[model samples]
Target: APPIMGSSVYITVELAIAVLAILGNVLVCWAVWLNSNLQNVTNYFVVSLAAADILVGVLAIPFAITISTGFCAACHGCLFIACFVLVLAQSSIFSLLAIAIDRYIAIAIPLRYNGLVTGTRAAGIIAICWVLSFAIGLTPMLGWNNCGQPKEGKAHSQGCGEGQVACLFEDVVPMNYMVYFNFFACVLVPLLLMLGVYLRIFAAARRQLADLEDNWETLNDNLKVIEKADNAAQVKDALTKMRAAALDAQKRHGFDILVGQIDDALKLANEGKVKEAQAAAEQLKTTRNAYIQKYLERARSTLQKEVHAAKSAAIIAGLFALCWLPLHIINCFTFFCPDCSHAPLWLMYLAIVLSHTNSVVNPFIYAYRIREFRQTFRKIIRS
Candidate 1:
């Protein structure tokens, strides 16, 4: 057995977190599926998200844990394990992008949401996500390129040392196409759409708030009458609740204001207002980035408050990059600079384990944040 240089305590924590995440997400999935009330279009996305996360938990984690614990001495699990990990990892990203797009449509076109996000449509979109993800993962396995090892005298000696080079999936068209498509389709498009939806949702909420403010005088008179005629305490409680809700709506609406500013900057740029647009763009960029920074700061301190689902998705995407980016960066670097030393065996193993961790975290976010899921889960357990 190889010496256990890694911290057992840290490993225990990660494993515990992973296990809890799987159970929680499973509860989410069961809740959504077993309850008819929870089977709306939005819940459909939730279900798919949970299912994808579950797949990651099931298919990716065991192999990763084994390798990380030094059970695979030869480190020869790459070709097979890498394929499984890549497919499942890409699937999770695709599912998240899909969810963001679904939410965008829901908020942006509320009147038409039912028609647009029907069950059939949700199913079709999920199918497409899986197909696209699988296809991208399959490219490296199809022999157009190689991944495991490099030739002894090759300009770039760095490659996966675990015997996976033969499965590189490097054929020019599929590989490049998959990379570009994954970047744009899974990352850029979903992010843009999420921003757009959040803005629209906030704008609508603000409009509603303005209407309420406009009628505040009338409402106050009505409330006065009710208090005089009926139970004043009940009326006061109701009003207090409404006020609290309104305050929350307004505070959350801040995200919309930020997004609107970004849109305005983009619009100006498109209209050929280069100088004005650049100025707006700079302000927008700063304002928007400030919001993100503040969000992270708050998330660090807050226990129960959930980050926006889109933000959660963004974090998952970010982690995917963090976990796998090093591996891919090294790969690309070796291509251009062939004489560089291969990524150290230990680092490669670490990256592989980190990549698996990405899958394990997705379902957890769903369980923690989604209320309907919790309700359904309780009902299921009782039954």
Candidate 2:
């Protein structure tokens, strides 16, 4: 209530993004649910991600006031809020990681699915993400928090004791846990994990494109070989009928030629004075190749689009790191010097805004960037 009008502006920004995040994820679920076309493991993870976003959106509504100011009483109370926040954030990233690997394993399968980790197995993966996220996120609550070690004689605030102390993120949560453990695992581990997975995804994707071109060209070459060996075999029937015609035309032309050898060289209608007409229907191999090149280009276009689609998982993971990493920087800050300086209020609020916006951008990316979602989204909106 003291410094500038920053609080009012921040409230507006935070609540608005919350509202938008809620709406976006709700639509994502609806679009996925209403459409049969989107049925698959990848979308299951998408819906899972959307579920996390929805929970975080509603949670943001509460955390905006209580935890933001750290004006709570009870050690477990505010700490759980902060830890839950991390859990959801981890769930989001885990869902994104799942999407990246799912897309990579599916490179061997085409656009559709089966015989590779199908529906039930995917259900197991989603549960695994939640389990891991919950385990990591709630680690502090298990006794790693500052509440474990008691302070000197004057640790009480309004008679709050060892387990009942007032809570703020930094005071109750340790800098060591934040920077060394959470930061080390989430900030570095998941980021690089996604990078490594997608690196292989990209390399294999390009090689797969190469194979399509090779097989297509070889098919064209085989057709050319067949055509060469069978040249004029297609015209065999025509030549059979023309045998009598050739005899008549030759005799008739011979009669005229002797009469006119003395006249010019006469045209032999068939084989006698042949002029080559190797036109062969203008096979137009050039135009044929032009169209063949067009086919290959269409195939290449699909490969690139799939690259963009799967590449979004990488971007989504990277973007999560961008939004969440700043908070870890603040976490690192508190570790070095608890009283070095309080992080600016507005700076802390900025991280909150960015993470909320993270939920906002994601729904749009799939609806606009991903083809199946776009199709169903349009239909669901219109219908």
Candidate 3:
């Protein structure tokens, strides 16, 4: 019901996204392969995310173009496309859920995280996630689809009766399945869990950072106390020398006034004169011997670990919400208020594009934001 949303524009953009997603996701796996540094358990989950998304990217273009604005009303092929989308999309969500849970475990039992979550264990979890994804995704094809009957509301009367059945995503996929099971059960549940998991991570990360800062502050103060003691020690030694230098009493300026300046050479002499030469007929007292010595060992992080632990996950979660939520929101609208579903086809296409764009977003994030990925990206290009 839109002004020529036509197959052309939507398919064109789909091709563009497809190309980017494929290229970017390939780079993600390629980087992970080349860089052992990226071989952590959480990053493995990211690879799973990339793998699923890239498969979508690789197949989505041809499928979209051939499907061409939704056809094959009763054709099982259209149902296949619908279920395939469900499969991959569910895998992506499952991977994200895994990622979120992994993060939660890491922060929850930080000390044991590395020891407790072994590589094989993570692989096991990932395999299970995909299995669940496949099971849930193909459920629609197992007789839950609308291909056998009418859809909800007014379109019900017009579907096979007034028309020869062109099929869009909504056409074959039951609204009930889309709303109740897909959106409510699969998507929202994971999303909510991830949101809380990330919320916990954000809070704990902030607290960790805050605690580290306070710990350094206290250490710095303790160093200052040592510095104060060292300063007084230097003063005591130098003053004792000054007195001896005075007591060596006169050196002729009519037996010299000895009201002398204790310069560099004098301080060197005085330092040699301290406890070492104590009472051994010294020369002069000097300031440099008492000069402040910096015992503070300044330190800071590699700037990678902190940013990785905090910002990367945070941004990923935020972008997921932004990209995926709109489509689900519209889905909710379509199912709940059927009359209001008269939105432009362009709007639906936009929602679809935005959601799929998430599949392409990660490589950009890693390549630009994280230094390690940037380094590996350069290596890949130059090689």
Number of the top TM-score candidate? 2
Q: How many angstroms is residue 365 displaced in model 3 relative to the true structure, after the best TM-score fit?
A: 0.4
- Candidate 1 wrongly placed segments (more than 4 Å): 1-21, 63-80, 147-351, 378-383
lDDT of 1 by residue, 118-186 (tens): 989888887887887777655555653333343322212433344323222221223343344444454
How many clashes show up per model? 11, 1, 3
Candidate 1 matches the true fold with a TM-score of 0.54
TM-score preference between candidates 1 and 3, better one:
3
Under the 3 Å rule for N, CA and C atoms, how many clashes does model 1 have? 11
TM-score each candidate: 0.54, 0.74, 0.72
| Residue 351, candidate 1: C-alpha displacement in angstroms | 4.4
- The order of the candidates by TM-score, greatest first, is 2, 3, 1
Query: Per-residue lDDT for 221 in model 3?
Result: 48
Model 3: how large is the Cα RMSD against the reference?
12.4
RMSD to native for every prediction? 16.8, 12.8, 12.4
lDDT of 3 by residue, 1-383 (tens): 46346666888788899999999989889989889999889889889988988987887656655555544355456777766767787888877777777877876676688888889998998899899888898888788877666443434543544433565677677888888998889888888888888788777766655654554354334333333433334534444444444334221231132323323323434454333332221232122122111111111242225436556766876787799889888888888897784557679878888987887898888877878888998899898
**Alpha-carbon shift of residue 214 in model 1 (angstroms):** 6.3
- Report the alpha-carbon TM-score of model 2 versus the true structure: 0.74
Per-model lDDT: 0.53, 0.68, 0.67
Model 2 lDDT tens row, 261-319: 21121212122321221132123244335554565577689778778977777777777
